[PDB]
Amino acid sequence: TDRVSVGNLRIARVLYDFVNNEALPGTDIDPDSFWAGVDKVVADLTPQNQALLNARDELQAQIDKWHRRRVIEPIDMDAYRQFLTEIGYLLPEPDDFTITTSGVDAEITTTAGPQLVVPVLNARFALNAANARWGSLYDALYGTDVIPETDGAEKGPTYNKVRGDKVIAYARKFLDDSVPLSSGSFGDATGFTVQDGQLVVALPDKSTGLANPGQFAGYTGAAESPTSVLLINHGLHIEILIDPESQVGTTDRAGVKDVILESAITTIMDFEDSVAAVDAADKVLGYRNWLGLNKGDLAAAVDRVLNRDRNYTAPGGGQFTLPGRSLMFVRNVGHLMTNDAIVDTDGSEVFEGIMDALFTGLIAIHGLKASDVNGPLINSRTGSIYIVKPKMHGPAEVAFTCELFSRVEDVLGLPQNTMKIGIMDEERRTTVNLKACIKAAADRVVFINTGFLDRTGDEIHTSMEAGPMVRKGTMKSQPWILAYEDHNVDAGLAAGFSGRAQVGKGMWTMTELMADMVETKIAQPRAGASTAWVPSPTAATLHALHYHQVDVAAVQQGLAGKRRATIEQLLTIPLAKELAWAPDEIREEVDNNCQSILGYVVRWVDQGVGASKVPDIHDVALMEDRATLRISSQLLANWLRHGVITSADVRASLERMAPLVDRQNAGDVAYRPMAPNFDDSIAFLAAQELILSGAQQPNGYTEPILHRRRREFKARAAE
Numbered sequence: 223t224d225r226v227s228v229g230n231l232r233i234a235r236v237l238y239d240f241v242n243n244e245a246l247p248g249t250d251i252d253p254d255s256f257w258a259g260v261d262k263v264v265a266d267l268t269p270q271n272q273a274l275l276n277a278r279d280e281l282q283a284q285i286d287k288w289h290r291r292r293v294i295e296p297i298d299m300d301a302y303r304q305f306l307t308e309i310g311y312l313l314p315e316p317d318d319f320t321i322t323t324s325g326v327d328a329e330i331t332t333t334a335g336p337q338l339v340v341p342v343l344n345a346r347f348a349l350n351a352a353n354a355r356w357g358s359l360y361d362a363l364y365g366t367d368v369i370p371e372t373d374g375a376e377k378g379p380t381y382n383k384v385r386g387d388k389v390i391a392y393a394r395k396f397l398d399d400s401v402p403l404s405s406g407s408f409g410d411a412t413g414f415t416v417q418d419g420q421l422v423v424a425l426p427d428k429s430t431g432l433a434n435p436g437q438f439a440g441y442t443g444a445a446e447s448p449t450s451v452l453l454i455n456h457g458l459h460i461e462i463l464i465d466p467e468s469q470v471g472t473t474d475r476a477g478v479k480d481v482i483l484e485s486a487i488t489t490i491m492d493f494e495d496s497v498a499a500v501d502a503a504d505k506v507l508g509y510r511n512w513l514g515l516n517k518g519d520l521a522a523a524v525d526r527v528l529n530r531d532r533n534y535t536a537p538g539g540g541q542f543t544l545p546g547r548s549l550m551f552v553r554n555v556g557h558l559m560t561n562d563a564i565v566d567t568d569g570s571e572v573f574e575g576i577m578d579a580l581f582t583g584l585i586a587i588h589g590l591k592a593s594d595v596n597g598p599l600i601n602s603r604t605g606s607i608y609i610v611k612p613k614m615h616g617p618a619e620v621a622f623t624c625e626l627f628s629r630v631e632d633v634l635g636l637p638q639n640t641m642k643i644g645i646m647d648e649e650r651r652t653t654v655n656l657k658a659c660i661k662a663a664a665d666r667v668v669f670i671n672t673g674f675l676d677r678t679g680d681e682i683h684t685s686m687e688a689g690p691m692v693r694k695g696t697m698k699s700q701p702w703i704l705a706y707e708d709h710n711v712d713a714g715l716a717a718g719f720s721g722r723a724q725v726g727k728g729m730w731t732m733t734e735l736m737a738d739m740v741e742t743k744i745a746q747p748r749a750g751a752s753t754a755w756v757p758s759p760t761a762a763t764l765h766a767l768h769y770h771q772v773d774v775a776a777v778q779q780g781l782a783g784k785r786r787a788t789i790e791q792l793l794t795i796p797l798a799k800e801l802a803w804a805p806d807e808i809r810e811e812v813d814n815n816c817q818s819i820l821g822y823v824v825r826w827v828d829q830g831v832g833a834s835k836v837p838d839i840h841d842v843a844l845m846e847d848r849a850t851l852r853i854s855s856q857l858l859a860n861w862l863r864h865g866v867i868t869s870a871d872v873r874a875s876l877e878r879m880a881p882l883v884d885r886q887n888a889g890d891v892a893y894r895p896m897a898p899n900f901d902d903s904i905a906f907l908a909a910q911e912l913i914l915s916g917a918q919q920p921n922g923y924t925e926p927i928l929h930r931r932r933r934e935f936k937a938r939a940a941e
C-alpha cells in the first residue's frame with residue numbers, strides 16, 4: 223500500500239502529504255500532534271457514529287413492520303403518532319429557549335440575501351461563486367429571459383440597442399421601487415452629484431434627493447461628479463455605475479453604465495451532494511480548493527482570481543471598505559459514508575464526516591487571517607468557522623456533530639464553539655424533532671434550511687410500506703411538505719433566529735427560467751426566509767431583487783409566536799388515493815424518473831461530475847444535486863413495491879430514456895453512450911441498481927451504490 227501508519231490509522235499518502243505540505247504550515251499546529259489528534263478522535267467517536275446509524279435502521283424496521291401489520295384502510299393518526307412516540311422516533315418538545323451562538327459575522331446574523339451552493343471540486347465555479355457577492359444587473363437582465371425577446375428585443379451575436387433599452391428601463395424601475403426619490407423617477411434622471419453629505423439627482427425640471435436620505439451609503443470619485451453612487455436598502459447595497467464613455471452609457475440619459483447588486487452574501491462550498499468524490503485523490507482535490515479559497519490564492523486557468531475588497535467614500539467624508547467576496551461556509555458530508563482516504567488496521571474505511579470535520583476545520587484556520595504563508599485574504603472577521611451538516615436524523619445526531627466539532631477544536635487548539643453549524647432540515651426525524659435539534663446546537667447554530675429533494679426522498683422511504691405514493695411533481699404541494707416549510711420557519715424564529723441566524727429555503731433548479739424565478743421565488747422571503755438557494759451568480763443577482771421588494775426582518779417580526787404547523791400535518795403521509803392515475807400518466811411518471819436518474823448518473827459515474835445543467839425529459843435544463851437520485855429512485859422503488867408498475871416497465875423505460883439521454887449529451891466530446899449496449903454501461907447498470915435495490919438502501923441513500931459504481935468506472939478506465 224501507499225499508506226502512512228499513525229496509531230491505528232493507515233492514511234492515504236496523497237492526503238498525508240497534502241496535509242503536511244499544504245494545509246498545516248501557517249496554522250501553528252504541531253504536525254505530529256495533529257495526526258495523533260486524528261487517530262484519537264476517530265477512535266473515540268466512531269462507535270457512537272456507528273450506534274447512530276444502527277438506531278436509524280432499528281427505527282425504520284419498526285416502522286416497516288407497523289405498516290405491514292395494518293389493514294384498516296385510512297391510517298389512524300392517533301395510533302401512528304403514539305407509536306412513533308413509543309419507539310423514541312418522536313421525542314418530547316423542549317421548553318422554549320433562545321440561541322446563544324456568539325461571534326457570528328454580519329452576513330449571517332443580520333443581512334438577508336441569496337445564498338450560492340457550489341461544488342468545491344470545481345475551482346472555476348468555486349471562484350465565480352466567491353466573486354458573486356457583487357454582480358451586474360445589466361448582465362443578468364440582458365442575458366436571461368427576464369427581458370422577453372419581443373418588440374423587437376431578440377438576442378443575437380451583437381449588441382441589441384432595443385434590448386439594452388428595456389434592460390435600462392427595468393433597472394430604473396427597480397431603483398424607483400427600492401430607493402425612491404422625494405419627487406420624480408430615476409427614469410428621468412440626467413445626473414448625480416454629492417453635495418453636503420447628500421445625494422443630489424438631476425431631473426429635467428427640478429432636483430431631488432432621496433425619500434429616505436439614509437439609503438445613501440457612499441460614492442466613488444469626486445463628490446462633484448461621482449464615478450458611482452452607493453445605495454443601501456434592506457441591508458443590501460446597490461451601485462450605480464456612472465460612466466458616459468461606455469457603449470451603454472453613451473445611450474443613457476444620465477450616463478449610467480450598469481447597476482451592480484450585492485447578491486450572493488454567503489456561499490456554501492460543497493463537499494456533499496453536488497460533488498463526486500469517492501476516494502483519497504478526489505477528497506484531496508476538494509480539500510486543496512477549499513485551502514486556496516481560505517488562503518485567498520486559489521486561481522483558475524481559462525486563458526481567474528479572487529476579487530479584492532471595494533473602496534468607497536462615506537456620505538459625510540472618510541474612506542471605507544466593503545467585502546468583495548461572499549462569506550464562505552463549507553458543507554461537510556453527513557454521518558453515513560466511509561471513505562478509503564483513511565483505513566484502520568483491519569482495512570475498515572474511516573467515517574468521512576469525521577474526516578471532513580478535521581480537515582475542513584483545519585483548513586478554515588487560514589481564512590481567519592492573511593499573510594505571506596497564509597495568502598492575502600480573510601473569510602470571517604469575527605473568528606468563526608461555518609460548517610453546514612447535511613442528512614442528520616434527530617437531536618442525538620445533532621449533539622453528536624456538536625461533540626465532534628468540540629473535539630476537533632481541541633485538536634486544532636481553537637476556542638470552543640469556533641466551529642459553527644448549519645442544521646439542514648432534510649430528514650423527517652429532524653423535521654418532527656426540530657426544536658430539540660436546534661437546542662442540541664444552541665451555542666453553535668447559525669443556520670437551518672429546507673429543500674425539496676432529500677426530504678421527499680426520506681418521506682417516501684420512511685413510509686415505503688404504507689402504500690403507493692403520489693407522483694414526484696405532486697409531492698411539492700402535499701400537506702406534509704407545506705407544513706414542513708412553515709414549521710421550519712416557526713422553529714427558527716421561536717428559537718430567536720431573527721437577528722442571529724439564517725432561515726433558508728431550497729434551490730431554484732430551472733437555470734434558464736429566470737423570468738419564472740423572478741416571478742415566483744419571491745414566495746420564500748415572503749415566508750420569512752432570510753436566505754434561499756440559487757443555481758448561479760446570475761440567479762443570485764436576480765434573486766436579490768426579491769430582498770429589496772420584501773422586508774424579511776419585518777416579515778419575521780410578524781410571524782413571531784405563531785404555530786402554523788401541527789404535528790398531525792407534518793405526519794400526513796403522501797399516499798395516493800385509489801385509482802389516481804391513467805395508464806399513460808403512470809408511463810409518463812416512470813419515464814420522468816428513469817430519465818432523471820439516467821441523466822444525472824451518467825455524468826456522475828463516467829466523469830465525476832455531481833452538478834451541471836442537465837436537460838430533463840422535456841429538455842428543460844435543471845441544476846439538481848445527488849438528492850434527485852434519492853427521490854427518483856425511492857418513488858420508483860415504491861411503485862414497484864406496491865405493484866403500480868412491473869419490472870418489465872422499469873427496464874423498458876430505462877432502455878427508452880437511455881438513447882434520449884445519449885442524445886441530450888451530443889455536445890460532449892468525452893461522453894460515452896449507454897445505448898444500445900445497456901448491460902455494458904456501468905452508468906446504465908448503476909441507474910438500474912438504484913431502482914431495483916432502492917427499497918433496501920438505508921433511508922434510501924444512493925451514495926453506497928453510486929460510489930461503488932464510480933469506483934468501478936475509475937478502475938475499468940485505469941486498465
Ligand SMILES: N#Cc1cc(Cl)ccc1O
Nearest residue numbers: 271272275276279920926
Ligand atoms: N449502510 C450502513 C450502515 C453502517 C453502519 Cl456502521 C451501521 C448501520 C448501517 O445501516
Ligand SMILES: N#Cc1cc(Cl)ccc1O
Nearest residue numbers: 360361364380381386389
Ligand atoms: N451583449 C450584451 C450585453 C448587454 C448588456 Cl445591457 C449587459 C451585458 C451584456 O453582455
Ligand SMILES: N#Cc1cc(Cl)ccc1O
Nearest residue numbers: 340347350757758833834
Ligand atoms: N458558478 C457556479 C455554479 C456551478 C455549478 Cl455546476 C453549480 C452551482 C453554481 O453556483
Ligand SMILES: N#Cc1cc(Cl)ccc1O
Nearest residue numbers: 339496729833845846847
Ligand atoms: N436541487 C438542488 C441543488 C443543486 C445544487 Cl448544485 C446544490 C444544492 C441543491 O439543493
Ligand SMILES: [Mg+2]
Nearest residue numbers: 495648676849
Ligand atoms: Mg440534500
